[PDB]
Design an enzyme around this catalytic site. Structure first.
Site, mmCIF file in Angstrom:
data_model
loop_
_atom_site.group_PDB
_atom_site.id
_atom_site.type_symbol
_atom_site.label_atom_id
_atom_site.label_comp_id
_atom_site.label_asym_id
_atom_site.label_seq_id
_atom_site.Cartn_x
_atom_site.Cartn_y
_atom_site.Cartn_z
ATOM 1 C CG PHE A 154 0.029 8.928 6.030
ATOM 2 C CD1 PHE A 154 -1.068 9.483 5.197
ATOM 3 C CD2 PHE A 154 0.045 7.922 6.696
ATOM 4 C CE1 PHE A 154 -2.112 8.597 5.063
ATOM 5 C CE2 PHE A 154 -1.123 7.067 6.849
ATOM 6 C CZ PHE A 154 -2.134 7.402 5.859
ATOM 7 C CG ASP A 155 2.526 4.101 6.316
ATOM 8 O OD1 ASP A 155 3.917 3.745 6.179
ATOM 9 O OD2 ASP A 155 2.066 3.104 6.800
ATOM 10 C CB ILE A 204 -8.130 1.960 10.031
ATOM 11 C CG1 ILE A 204 -7.279 2.035 8.653
ATOM 12 C CG2 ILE A 204 -7.121 2.582 11.181
ATOM 13 C CD1 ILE A 204 -6.766 3.521 8.289
ATOM 14 C CG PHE A 239 -4.838 3.739 2.670
ATOM 15 C CD1 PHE A 239 -3.604 3.824 3.202
ATOM 16 C CD2 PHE A 239 -6.156 3.948 3.122
ATOM 17 C CE1 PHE A 239 -3.716 4.314 4.465
ATOM 18 C CE2 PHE A 239 -6.052 4.516 4.275
ATOM 19 C CZ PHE A 239 -4.904 4.547 4.965
ATOM 20 C CE1 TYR A 249 0.825 -0.904 4.370
ATOM 21 C CE2 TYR A 249 0.402 1.502 4.445
ATOM 22 C CZ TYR A 249 1.196 0.607 4.991
ATOM 23 O OH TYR A 249 1.606 0.448 6.208
ATOM 24 C CE1 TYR A 264 -5.125 5.790 13.491
ATOM 25 C CE2 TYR A 264 -5.176 6.366 11.410
ATOM 26 C CZ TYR A 264 -4.654 5.549 12.399
ATOM 27 O OH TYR A 264 -3.447 4.775 12.264
#
Lengths: 48, 790, 183, 108
Positions: free
Chosen positions: D37-38, D57, D100, D27, D83
């Site tokens: 961010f990732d 999540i 994503f 991902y 979140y």
């Protein structure tokens, strides 16, 4: 993420064109409609 | 740089064995696509059709693609839509197809790197004929009678040819039978043919008169001498007419007469091309299909020699006929025009340079510069602080030598040395031990007019010097810094034993090099700006905080009446999704003495990189992305741009004294609106979510006091500071923090040449496989991103 | 015309010509009547050395109006100096870093007003400087003269010392004459 | 659901993740503003999680559940299912939508 400068590794991109230029102007012999094709022999997604 | 998700059957990212068909139509204009022969539900439209459009593919490492452009340069795998022409027909007969990078400031070959200048233009292929305007040319009456003869002789030049090609006279023309009703005497010729011949002869006479050539009837007795040709009976048709063309074999033409004939042929070709273009014809490649496709509507130079002769023979026959009758032509010399040449802008000259951190403050250093293309180039040394928008050596920041004119530049120009030619090598040496600068051309020192070898001497070292070169239009060069001194060509002849070491001696890796690129960018107005000044005005109880922009040097002998492009330092970003107050507001006050017709006020996106002497809202970059359904019905249409502004001229037309224009933005809906003196204008814009818009004013100054930003507030609208700074989001007090400053556009900047480049490989696979482009070895770079400027 | 050919294909005639020119220039420098006589000849006969120097351009935009006999002669354009300036690359040719060290030593000795024999003796003592050719810091000069023939007799100390002495003498006197010409 | 799936490269369209299966997925998650961010492709390590255990999540798990084997698709996890009021401090700001680029490598 709006005060400190960001950093990131980005892939370099390059553009390639044939020697064909088409334009539209008044009193010109240029033809308006044009067509071409591209064949994709191999794409390696996620190489880096 | 905004993607619009388009609907297609079997939607997927481009992968192997995919055929992408691209269709362009400058008539609408509209750009549309097809994937694997299936249409894509969407297209681009309403974009600027100025400039030349070319096919393009952008890629990163790890792809192989093949252009197919029809004919022998690629075999189409799907039928082009009706009326659409393959791209290979856009080439001239002389041009040979090739694949090239879109923009290029350097070319590497076998480990040798050539630094390139800028190309002035590209393959326009647009004839746009401009034949000589003979409408105002009046045919003198005394020249008409001879003209009436010439066209008659021209008639013979038709009729006899019909006999020579096998054509036979008949009541009705027949291609199979070689028949034509026109095969009759000039008197018996139909009125249409006689009118055409008279009109053509009058056009030729007016063309001759417009050229300045003087016609003089100096041989009244020559007409008696002139005789026809006794054609045998085989020429005559059944009607009883036998052509009698004038015997013009003995007639001879002067070199000036030959030049006149050639000019007349060129003018006739241009007139015919203009007529064909007005008829709807268009240039084609080796095809004369009756769908208004003619392969001869080109410039005269590119025209076929046989095609040239086809009409040049008739024109020379007419010229010989005129000379026989005694009407001698005397053209005037063309030197009376007194032509001139233009000056290339400093934005179009490319500066190459070694990085400032390599500056030398002592020692004796040597480097070479090979001039592949002899021409407008400069080479020498540069101080840290040299700017890309000033000619190399026109100030105190660079010591250069220009070899096209044999001059040396430092704070001016002085003749020095001798000019170069293609393939020359300039060896530049600096002696920082005793403040000297020497040049050599092909191993031989260049000396001043006083016999000294020192091109420059007695300069202050200060920071130091780095190699610099400047390349003009279509110029090429090779800067050799001495990473391998055995690659030097004249180092040993002059430079080695004199104590000079290669510039890049005892270095492990290549030397970082910078260049100058013409990408206009907004930068903060300095305290030393030579044209405009910005004054902050604190916010009182009534007056909101303001930024007043005034012209420093207007009304004096140094006045510069050129456009000024001002922006505010910080943006105002719209919400990421669209549906206390979500509206932002700012105002501009134009002082008395500033014409509102020369002021545009509004917003600009971060991607506005336009700079020009004259501004016009009509000439703006725009596009509309239309998205259709499965049946092609349009269910959305998005319009993009990078400049949402309003003109003061329209406001004054719909409306001395100061003028106030207020700009308001609904961030939750992304709606931009304007209001002059309270009344709401009809000019409204809509922008997409996540859009950053900077306040902007573009104006041509007409007075010393130019304008002022007012960062005020009104009911239901936030101040600019509240919308920009999250700290003051709750606070309703208008503020002008020191981070909010007025910036102006600057047109040229230094930019670092990348250490490595993508290794793209192009090749013509075959006459049915098109042209191959592959890039396989990956390349990356660590980018530093300035968040507010995007 | 022939300097490039001489540099690419070194021979003995070119070296002898350099030695002769250097000796004449040295006599010109040391002697005081020589320079005055040369200047008198140039001024009286109105010889323009620039014709013989740069005769092998702003004219349309120059209207000269000042001319003096004293401006007809200058040490920069003197043929005695210029001939040595043009033959010097034929004397320094194929000098390795060790020879450059020896030349610098000889020039330093000449700076103290020493005779030729004293400088030759000093070069004889400091004959270990040739190993500077094997230094790593100057390894970039090791193959500059590969194209040139680089063919010579067996190594001889006396010949190298004499060659370095002549080269250093010519270079030192040329630098001395040229320094005052600078502003 | 709170996740919007947009296909990029199709899979087999037949083999979908089931209960008690590990979904090896590569991902690349970024904020709605384009700020990454990732990314598991930077680490050269595909991410493994089991359906029905609530390891990841909610939006990510639902999107991978809808995805098929060997399928690359874009998942938009709204703050409700990713979140929300409390995000990863110092990484993900509060009330942030996440995007994503998820590829379902393996179902083992």
């Amino acid at each position: 993420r709006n005060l400190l400068l960001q950093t990131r590794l980005i892939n370099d991109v390059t553009s390639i064109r044939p020697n064909i230029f088409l334009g539209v102007a008044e009193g010109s012999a240029q033809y308006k409609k044009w067509y071409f094709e591209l064949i994709i022999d191999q794409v390696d997604p996620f190489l880096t | 740089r905004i993607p619009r998700a388009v609907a297609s059957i079997n939607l997927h990212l481009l992968r192997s064995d995919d055929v992408v068909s691209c269709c362009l139509d400058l008539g609408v204009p509209s750009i549309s696509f097809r994937i694997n022969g299936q249409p894509v539900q969407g297209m681009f439209e309403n974009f600027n059709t100025d400039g030349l459009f070319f096919p393009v593919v952008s890629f990163s490492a790890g792809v192989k693609v093949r252009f197919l452009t029809g004919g022998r340069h690629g075999e189409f795998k799907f039928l082009p839509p009706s009326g659409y022409a393959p791209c290979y027909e856009a080439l001239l007969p002389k041009e040979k197809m090739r694949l090239e990078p879109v923009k290029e400031y350097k070319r590497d070959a076998e480990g040798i790197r050539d630094l390139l200048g800028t190309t002035q233009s590209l393959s326009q292929a647009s004839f746009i004929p401009c034949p000589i305007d003979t409408s105002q040319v009046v045919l003198p009456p005394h020249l008409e009678k001879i003209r009436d003869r010439l066209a008659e002789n021209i008639h013979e030049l038709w009729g006899m040819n019909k006999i020579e090609l096998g054509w036979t006279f008949g009541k009705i023309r027949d291609d199979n039978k070689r028949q034509h009703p026109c095969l009759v005497e000039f008197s018996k010729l139909p009125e249409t043919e006689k009118n055409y011949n008279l009109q053509m002869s009058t056009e030729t006479l007016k063309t001759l008169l417009a050229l300045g050539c003087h016609i003089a009837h100096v041989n009244p007795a020559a007409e008696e001498d002139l005789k026809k040709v006794k054609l045998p009976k085989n020429y005559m048709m059944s009607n009883g007419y036998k052509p009698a063309p004038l015997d013009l074999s003995d007639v001879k033409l002067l070199p000036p007469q030959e030049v006149l004939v050639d000019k007349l042929a060129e003018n006739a070709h241009n007139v015919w091309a203009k007529d064909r273009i007005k008829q709807g014809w268009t240039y084609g490649i080796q095809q004369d299909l009756k769908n208004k496709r003619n392969p001869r509507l080109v410039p005269y130079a590119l025209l076929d020699e046989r095609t040239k002769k086809s009409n040049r023979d008739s024109l020379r026959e007419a010229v010989r006929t005129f000379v026989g009758y005694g009407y001698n032509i005397e053209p005037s010399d063309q030197e009376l025009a007194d032509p001139a040449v233009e000056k290339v802008s400093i934005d179009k000259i490319r500066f190459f340079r070694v990085e400032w951190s390599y500056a030398v403050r002592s020692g004796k250093w040597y480097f070479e510069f090979e001039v592949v293309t002899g021409g407008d180039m400069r080479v020498g040394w540069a101080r840290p602080g040299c700017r890309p928008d000033i000619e190399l050596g026109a100030d105190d920041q660079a010591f250069v030598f220009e070899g096209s004119r044999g001059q040396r530049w430092h704070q001016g120009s002085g003749y020095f040395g001798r000019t170069w030619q293609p393939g020359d090598v300039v060896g530049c040496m600096i002696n920082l031990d005793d403040a000297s600068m020497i040049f050599t051309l092909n191993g031989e020192l260049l000396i001043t007019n006083k016999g000294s070898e020192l091109a420059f001497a007695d300069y202050e070292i200060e920071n130091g010097f780095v190699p610099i070169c400047s390349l003009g239009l279509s110029q090429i060069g090779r800067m050799n810094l001495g990473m391998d001194a055995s690659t030097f060509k004249f180092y040993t002849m002059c430079g080695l034993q004199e104590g000079f070491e290669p510039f890049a001696v005892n270095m492990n890796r290549d030397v970082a090099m910078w260049f100058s690129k013409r990408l206009p960018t907004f930068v903060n107005v300095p305290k030393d700006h030579p044209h405009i000044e910005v004054v902050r005005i604190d916010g009182t109880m009534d007056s909101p905080p303001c930024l007043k922009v005034t012209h420093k040097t207007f009304g004096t002998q140094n006045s510069n009446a050129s456009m000024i492009y001002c922006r505010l330092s910080m943006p105002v970003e719209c919400h990421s999704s669209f549906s206390t107050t979500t509206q932002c507001y700012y105002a501009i006050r134009i002082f008395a003495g500033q014409d509102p017709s020369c002021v545009w006020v509004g917003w600009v996106t971060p991607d506005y990189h336009l700079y020009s002497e004259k501004f016009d809202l009509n000439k703006n970059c725009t596009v509309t992305v239309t998205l259709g359904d499965e049946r092609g019905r349009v269910h959305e249409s998005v319009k993009r741009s990078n400049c949402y502004m309003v003109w003061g001229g329209d406001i004054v037309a719909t409306s001395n004294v100061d003028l106030e224009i207020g700009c308001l933005v609904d961030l939750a809906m992304g709606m931009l609106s304007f209001s002059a003196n309270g009344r709401e204008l009809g000019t409204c814009y809509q922008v997409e979510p996540n859009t950053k818009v900077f306040p902007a004013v573009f104006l041509q100054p007409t007075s010393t006091a130019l304008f002022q930003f007012e960062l005020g507030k009104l009911k239901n609208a936030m101040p600019l500071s509240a919308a920009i700074f999250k700290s003051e989001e709750k606070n309703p007090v208008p503020q002008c923090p020191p981070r909010l400053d007025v910036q102006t556009i600057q047109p040229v900047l230094w930019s670092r040449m990348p250490s490595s480049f993508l290794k793209v490989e192009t090749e013509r696979v075959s006459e049915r496989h098109g042209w191959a482009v592959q890039c396989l070895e990956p390349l990356q770079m660590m980018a530093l991103h300035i968040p507010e400027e995007n | 015309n022939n300097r490039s050919n001489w540099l690419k294909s070194p021979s003995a005639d070119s070296d002898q010509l350099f030695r002769m020119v250097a000796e004449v220039f040295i006599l010109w420098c040391k002697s005081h009547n020589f320079k005055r006589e040369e200047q008198n000849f140039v001024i009286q006969n109105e010889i323009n050395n620039l014709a013989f120097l740069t005769g092998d351009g702003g004219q349309d935009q120059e209207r000269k109006k000042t001319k003096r006999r004293g401006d007809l002669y200058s040490i920069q354009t003197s043929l005695i100096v210029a001939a040595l300036k043009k033959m010097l690359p034929i004397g320094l040719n194929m000098c390795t870093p060790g020879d450059q060290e020896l030349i610098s030593l000889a020039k330093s000795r000449y700076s103290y007003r020493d005779t030729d024999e004293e400088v030759k003796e000093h070069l004889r003592n400091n004959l270990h400087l040739q190993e500077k050719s094997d230094d790593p810091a100057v390894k970039w000069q090791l193959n500059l003269y590969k194209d040139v023939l680089k063919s010579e007799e067996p190594f001889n100390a006396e010949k190298t010392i004499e060659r370095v002495q002549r080269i250093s003498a010519a270079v030192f006197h040329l630098e001395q004459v040229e320094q005052p010409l600078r502003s | 659901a709170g996740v919007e799936i947009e296909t990029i490269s199709p899979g087999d369209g037949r083999t979908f993740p089931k209960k008690g299966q590990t979904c090896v997925v590569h991902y690349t998650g970024m904020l709605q503003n384009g700020k990454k961010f990732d990314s598991s492709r930077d680490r050269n390590k595909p991410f493994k999680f089991r359906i029905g255990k609530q390891e990841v999540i909610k939006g990510f798990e639902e999107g991978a559940a809808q995805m098929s084997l060997g399928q690359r698709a874009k998942l938009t996890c709204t703050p409700d299912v990713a979140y929300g009021a409390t995000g990863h401090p110092g990484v993900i700001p509060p009330n942030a939508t996440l995007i994503f680029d998820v590829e379902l490598l393996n179902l083992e």
